Amino acid sequence: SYELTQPRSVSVSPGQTARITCGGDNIASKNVHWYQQKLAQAPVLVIYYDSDRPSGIPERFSGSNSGNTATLTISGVEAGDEADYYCQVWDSYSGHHVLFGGGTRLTVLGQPKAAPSVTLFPPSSEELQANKATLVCLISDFYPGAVEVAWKADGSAVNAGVETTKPSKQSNNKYAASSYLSLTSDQWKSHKSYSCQVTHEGSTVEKTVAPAECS
Amino acid sequence: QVQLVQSGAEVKKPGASVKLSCKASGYTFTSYSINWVRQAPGQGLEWMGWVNPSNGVTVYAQKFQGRVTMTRDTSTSTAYMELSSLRFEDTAVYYCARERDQLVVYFDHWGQGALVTVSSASTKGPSVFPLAPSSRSTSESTAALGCLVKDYFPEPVTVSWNSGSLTSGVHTFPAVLQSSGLYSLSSVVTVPSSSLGTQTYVCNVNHKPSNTKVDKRVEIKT
Amino acid sequence: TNLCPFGEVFNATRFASVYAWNRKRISNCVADYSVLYNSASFSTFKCYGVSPTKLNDLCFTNVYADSFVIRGDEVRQIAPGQTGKIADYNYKLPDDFTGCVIAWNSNNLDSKVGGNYNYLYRLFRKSNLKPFERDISTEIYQAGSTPCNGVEGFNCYFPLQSYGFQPTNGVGYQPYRVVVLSFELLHAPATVCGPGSH
Ligand SMILES: *[C@@H]1O[C@H](CO)[C@@H](O)[C@H](O)[C@H]1NC(C)=O
């Protein structure tokens, strides 16, 4: 069937003007509409009847449609607007179809370079009674991704039972991630002290915990 | 104005049937058709069909027809959509949306979407463990504590503190897929150390696909 | 500053079945209506309430373009107060239609050898269509008193029909592309204006 053509992703510096296109054979014949799906949430309508904004949508959103392309223009884009954008039309021509686009991953190369906030948590007593021991290393509010994380038992690099999530944005429009170290209840107490060491943009900070606390 | 409240993110085995609800608030229920759109993970949007609350007319897409059944209930102002003969590629987020215009199809409001995952069964509730504030958290003006959910089936899980009351200074992290194939995540909160003893902090965790609510009180281990 | 996109509505390569006619809302531009009737190629160009040549001196809050395809004999059903299969069950015009109806033969395009059965039209309905109403449902009609517990069967019929568009067809059954332009003035500032409104 007939289908809409959207770019993979468009990236702009903050305050620039982002433009997301939507391609279709004489796509001007039908009315297009644009929806913003923010990161990992319900989508919301930003543009309808190719130009109009719902009451509440900022005026920096503006649409157009002609020829074989409909264009969404976001002037003065900020990090908040960073989301996915989908253009949708009605095509009864192709057997009663509500056609969507492939989406586009708008990305802002944010100027802020945020140093991370890291908290380390030793395994709880209740978990120890469950014959488990997991150390939790929480990192948040860092703008560049923090590719370098590591665990050290007694100052020795250890990779036995290390899990780490892909960095992901938060409501701050900064990045957050977490790392879990798995251990048996024995090795947690046996080793002198464990430490979560995190580097980011060539800057290193580490947090150390020991089992002797309140034991 | 208008809200579309969906049902819980049910999770079932291949070949089964899953029925989702969507109730509308504020507006005259029968005035606007209700459409259903699903989203495969990390992929685009697929239109599934719509049903008219006024008369019960059901229109479906070519792909899903023969499996999908959309129904209406005006006495409750609620629509529902039923999908049978599930396969693995049906693992998706299903939203309900309001058809503002019948001649030019476009959607005003959206449901938050319910996550239906079709895998080889084995749904499990989470393991919940508390994280007491450290002695370097009690020395700080602001201490840090939180809850930890561990080894539940790949699912959606919700963590709210004091049943959605304490929100300032709370971060709920992305769920991580262990090599075991189970999800796990942590929910942390920074609270002033002056209120560690006076105020009691209890985190509520809810896992709909396994249908498990946990209320865990976070203490300070003496 | 950008003129209304009429060229991409007629010169569009794809048209919809009549029961599934497409409507586009035209707003916020200057429409040069002359280029329509300057293209003296249309088999049907009939205007109601408004003079075609003076349209270029007119302003509207909104314009609406409805595009579909029918067989040429059915073209005359595209008119106010008309009665027939298309008028009752596919696309109904009000008795006060202020706008133009344009149609032109597209046998060379929408008649594919061996048939182009993609273009459809509705055959029954429980009630005749209200003005500017579209129906694309596929519920199995119940002409029989007995309830239609059957998708197909005696007194339960599939309510859609296919136009057998073939290049050797009769002209009365040759495919024709149809555009209906309606002019709506609303209690809000006008958005589509003619070039001569100066
Ligand atoms: C498109 O419409 C007609 C018919 O397709 C064509 O002759 C003309 O060049 C284009 N411009 C107009 C009149 O909209």
DSSP state of A18: E
What does this entry list as its resolution, in Å? Answer: 4.2
Q: Which amino acid is at A191?
A: H
Q: Which residue has the tokens 């900064």?
A: A174
For residue A189, the one-letter residue type is: K
Q: Does C151 touch chain B (CB under 8 A)?
A: no
CATH classification at residue A148: 2.60.40.10
Domain assignment of residue B71, yes or no: yes
Return the H-helix or E-strand segment holding A21. strand A17-23
Residues B66 and B145 in one domain: no
Same domain, A124 and A170: yes
Are the C-beta atoms of residues B110 and B4 closer than 8 Å to each other? yes
Reading the block at residue A119, the tokens are 């908290």
Q: Of how many residues is chain C composed?
A: 198
Host domain of residue B132: 127-218
Say if ligand 1 is within 6 A of residue C10 CB.
yes
Residues 6+ apart with CB under 8 A from C184: C60, C61, C62, C63, C64
Q: Which atom of ligand 1 lies at the shortest distance from residue C36's CA?
A: 13
| C-beta of C13 in contact with ligand 1 (< 6 A) | no
Tell whether B187 is covered by a domain. Answer: yes
Angle at the Cα of B61 from the Cα atoms of B55 and B66, rounded to 5 degrees: 85
Q: Clarify whether residues B59 and B145 are in a common domain.
A: no
C107 Cβ contact list (under 8 Å, min separation 6) = C165, C167, C169, C171, C174, C175
- A171 and A193 within one domain: yes
Note down the domain range covering A192. 117-209
Residues A59 and A128 reside in one and the same domain: no
Same domain, B7 and B107: yes
**Residue B111, Cβ neighbours under 10 Å: how many?**
25
Q: Is residue A30 part of a domain?
A: yes
C8 CA to centre of ligand 1 in angstroms: 8
Q: How far is CA C93 from CA A114, B10, B55, B79, C6, in A?
A: 63, 47, 23, 32, 21
Is C11's CB within 8 Å of A65's CB? no
Residues B96 and B17 reside in one and the same domain: yes
Counted domains in chain B:
2
A138/A64 same-domain check: no
Instruction: Mutate one of A120, A136, A168, A169 to test the B interface: name it (highest B CB count within 10 A).
Output: A136
Please list every residue in chain C whose beta carbon sits closer than 8 Å to the beta carbon of residue B104: 23-25
**HSE-up (13 A, CA, CB side) for residue A197:** 16
* Residue A107 CB burial class (10 angstroms; 0-12, 13-18, ≥19): middle
> Are B144 and B76 in the same domain?
no
A138-160 exposure pattern, b = at least 16 Cβ within 10 A, e = fewer:
bbbbbbbebeebbbbbeeeebee
Last residue of a domain, one of B116, B143, B176: B116
Report CA(A26)–ligand 1 centroid distance (Å): 13
Give A93's contacts in chain C (Cβ within 8 Å): 14-17, 20, 22
Q: From the CA of A14, how many Å to the nearest CA of chain B?
A: 25
CA–CA separation, B151 and B205 (whole Å): 13
- The tally of domains found in chain A comes to 2
Chains with ≥3 CB–CB distances under 8 Å to C:
A, B
Residue B162 lies in a domain: yes
Quickly tell me which residue has 């200074």 as its tokens: B169
| Residue of C64, C134, C138 to mutate, interface with B, max B Cβ within 10 Å | C138
Stated as kind and residue range, the H or E segment containing A135 is strand A133-142
Both B78 and B140 in a single domain? Answer: no
Domain edge (last residue) among A82, A108, A134: A108
Residues A132 and A59 in one domain: no
Distance CA B114, CA B72 (A): 18
Percent helix, strand, coil in chain C (nearest 5)?
A: 20, 30, 50
Instruction: List the Cα angle C91/C136/A66 in 5-degree steps.
Output: 75
**Inter-residue contact B100 to B108 (CB < 8 Å):** yes
Q: Which two tokens stand for residue B214?
A: 């946990």
- Rounded distance between C-alpha atoms, residue B152 and residue C87, angstroms: 59
Give the whole-angstrom CA distance, residue A134 versus residue A162: 10
Phi, psi at A37, each rounded to 5°: -100, 105
Pairing of strands C120-122, C160-162: antiparallel
Both B112 and B144 in a single domain?
no
Residue holding tokens 């913003």? A36
Instruction: Return the CATH number at B188.
Output: 2.60.40.10
Q: B221: closest CA among A94, A122, C151?
A: A122
**A127 and A104 in one domain?**
no
d(CA C18, CA C71): 10
Which chains would you list as touching B if contact means 3+ CB atom pairs under 8 Å? Answer: A, C
Method: X-ray
Q: Are A18 and A46 in contact (CB under 8 A)?
A: no
> What is the DSSP secondary structure assignment for residue C110, as one 8-state letter?
H
Same domain, B161 and B111: no
Are B22 and B106 members of one domain? Answer: yes
Does B161 lie in the same domain as B206?
Answer: yes
Same-domain status, A126 and A104 = no
The answer to whether the CB of A118 falls within 8 A of the CB of A142 is no
Within 10 A of A34 (CB to CB), how many other CB atoms are there? 25
Between the two ends of chain C, the Cα-to-Cα distance in Å is 15
Q: Helix (H, G, I), strand (E, B), or coil: what is residue C36?
A: helix
The last residue of one of the domains, among A76, A108, A140, is A108
Pick from A45, A73, A108: which residue ends a domain? Answer: A108
Are residues B31 and B94 part of one domain?
Answer: yes
Statement to judge: residues B48 and B138 lie in one domain: no
Cα atoms found within 13 Å of the Cα of residue B143, Cβ hemisphere only: 21
Closest atom of ligand 1 to C8 CA is: 1
Do residues A8 and A105 lie in contact, with contact meaning Cβ atoms separated by under 8 Å? Answer: yes
**CA gap B191, B5 in Å, rounded:** 32
Residues of C in contact with A28 (CB under 8 A): 5, 8-9, 12
CB of C38 closer than 6 angstroms to any ligand 1 atom: no
